Amino acid sequence: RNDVPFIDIILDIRPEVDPLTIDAPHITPDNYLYINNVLYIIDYKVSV
Amino acid sequence: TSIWFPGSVTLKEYLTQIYLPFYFNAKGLHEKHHVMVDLAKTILEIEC
Amino acid sequence: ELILPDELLFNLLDQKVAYQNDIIATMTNQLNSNTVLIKRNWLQGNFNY
Amino acid sequence: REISKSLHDQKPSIHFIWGAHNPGNSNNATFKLILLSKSLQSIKGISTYTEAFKSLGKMMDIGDKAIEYEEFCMSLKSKARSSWKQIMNKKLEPKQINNALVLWEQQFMINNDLIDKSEKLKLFKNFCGIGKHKQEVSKPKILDFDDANMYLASLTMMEQSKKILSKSNGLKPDNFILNEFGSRIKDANKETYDNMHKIFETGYWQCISDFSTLMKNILSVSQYNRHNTFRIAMCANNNVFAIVFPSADIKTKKATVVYSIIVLHKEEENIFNPGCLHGTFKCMNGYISISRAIRLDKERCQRIVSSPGLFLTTCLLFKHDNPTLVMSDIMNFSIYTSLSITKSVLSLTEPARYMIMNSLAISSNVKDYIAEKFSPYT
RNA sequence: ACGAGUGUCGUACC
RNA sequence: AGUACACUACU
RNA sequence: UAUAAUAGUAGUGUA
């Protein structure tokens, strides 16, 4: 996934939470990984 | 045509025969007594 | 100023026979001064870049 | 330069003379020592130093007395190797066996009784260069490289060396390099293995290996050397011997090694002489050959010891992947270049690059380089 | 002898 | 027995 | 954002 909105991450991980939830930040993480009740925000960087 | 002995050589082998003999030399074959004077002579000649 | 090595003066002062055209002695002022003034020859390898 | 036309003004191409081993003689050190002493004292004819050589053979003679020589050497070596630190404060005591004043294994005093004073002076002053003169403008004397006669002489010398050294040793090679890496070299390339085996089968490899071993033995023995002791150095070959004349110990600065090669051969003119033969005399059972005294720095001796590797590498690199070349010619060129420890070949190896590459190039001032920079030193 | 050299050297010294 | 540019060895 | 790092000794190749 690329530039997935954080609100989409919240909705996918927690479908039960309703809209009008706490306002997700402007951050658009590159990827997210949910395992063992832990959410990892993954961002790719190509720099020296 | 080969250089140091009869036969035919490839261009790579020809360049090898041209350039390898330089490495047959032995370091430290000079004598200080004469090379000191020779180097001084050439330096002072250029300066003059 | 380029300083001539001590051993070079050692084996140049013990010749016992004057050289035909001694470039070393001319520049050294008849072996009066070990140093020789070098102007245009920046020394080998010093100014590579 | 001072151009010379005489063939006798040549300097040695290789500071060594070699002759094939004798299968009919034992390879024991004492037997070879006795044979060398007898052959030196059995020299016939008249010459400047022949009396000196016979007297030296008399000095290195143990006669029928042989067992206590081995006992003496073993007893001294056992005490010498029993201490990590060099044995000091104790003086080595000479022990005459028969006509030989043996100080150490293969180390003998100059028996002034055996030698005439004039002969000893000739051997030490005019032959070994020891004590010559005391504490003339000229120019560097070099052979005429473009002379037809000089080039013919050089070609004849190379042809003779190729003739003598191309013959097989008659023995299975069985050496360290082969037994330890033959499988790897053979799997990498069959032809390389075949070329290496051919190198080991010929007399070039035996000659250079014997010379390297002899130089190593000379370096080993020369550390315990005194002003009145001449050492005997031996190699695997039972016909090649070395006389190590008195000189300063190696550990000091500018230390040099003085040695002379002796070769015993059944028939005369069957020796590899790379311009370093003093004289071929007739002794019992055959002909002895004595080379001119050679003085060498420690760096040159180190290169000489390392020379078998250089020879093998050069031969295999020139013959690599080339079926149109004759291995004998490559080995003939490599024997001389590998053991070249003089500046004469140094003055030729480097300018060859520029000369041949400018000749092969499109635009080049090869004429200017040859005229103003190419300065052969032959 | 050998090494070096179109620089007088190394070459053990009394 | 120096300047630089490296590579490889040992502590 | 193609830029921050550098023990001592020895050997080798290069200019």
From Swiss-Prot, chain A:
Superkingdom classification of source: Viruses
Documented effect of changing residue 45 to A: Complete loss of nuclease activity
Chain positions recorded as Mn(2+) 2 binding sites: 3, 30
Residues engaged in binding Mn(2+) 1: 30, 43-44
Disulfide cross-links: none
Subcellular location(s) of the protein: Host Golgi apparatus; Host endoplasmic reticulum; Host endoplasmic reticulum-Golgi intermediate compartment; Virion
Domain comment in the entry: The N-terminus contains the endonuclease activity (endoN). The central region contains the RdRp activity. The C-terminus contains the cap-binding region.
Subunit structure as annotated in this protein's UniProt entry: Homomultimer. Interacts with the glycoprotein N; this interaction allows efficient polymerase packaging into virus particles. Interacts with nucleoprotein N.
Function: RNA-dependent RNA polymerase, which is responsible for the replication and transcription of the viral RNA genome using antigenomic RNA as an intermediate. During transcription, synthesizes subgenomic RNAs and assures their capping by a cap-snatching mechanism, which involves the endonuclease activity cleaving the host capped pre-mRNAs. These short capped RNAs are then used as primers for viral transcription. The 3'-end of subgenomic mRNAs molecules are not polyadenylated. During replication, the polymerase binds the 5' and 3' vRNA extremities at distinct sites.
Family: Belongs to the Bunyavirales RNA polymerase family.
Note, other: Classified as His(+) endonuclease since it has a histidine upstream of the active site that coordinates the first cation.
Protein's name according to its UniProt entry: RNA-directed RNA polymerase L
Annotated organism of origin: Bunyavirus La Crosse
Section covered of the full-length record: 50 to 97 of 2263
UniProtKB/Swiss-Prot annotation, chain C:
Domain of life, source organism: Viruses
Leader sequence residues: none
Subcellular location: Host Golgi apparatus; Host endoplasmic reticulum; Host endoplasmic reticulum-Golgi intermediate compartment; Virion
Subunit and interaction comment: Homomultimer. Interacts with the glycoprotein N; this interaction allows efficient polymerase packaging into virus particles. Interacts with nucleoprotein N.
Domain comment quoted from the record: The N-terminus contains the endonuclease activity (endoN). The central region contains the RdRp activity. The C-terminus contains the cap-binding region.
Family: Belongs to the Bunyavirales RNA polymerase family.
Note from the entry: Classified as His(+) endonuclease since it has a histidine upstream of the active site that coordinates the first cation.
Stated role: RNA-dependent RNA polymerase, which is responsible for the replication and transcription of the viral RNA genome using antigenomic RNA as an intermediate. During transcription, synthesizes subgenomic RNAs and assures their capping by a cap-snatching mechanism, which involves the endonuclease activity cleaving the host capped pre-mRNAs. These short capped RNAs are then used as primers for viral transcription. The 3'-end of subgenomic mRNAs molecules are not polyadenylated. During replication, the polymerase binds the 5' and 3' vRNA extremities at distinct sites.
Name the record gives this protein: RNA-directed RNA polymerase L
Species whose genome carries this gene: Bunyavirus La Crosse
Protein encoded by which gene: L
Residues of the full protein shown: 1102 to 1150 of 2263
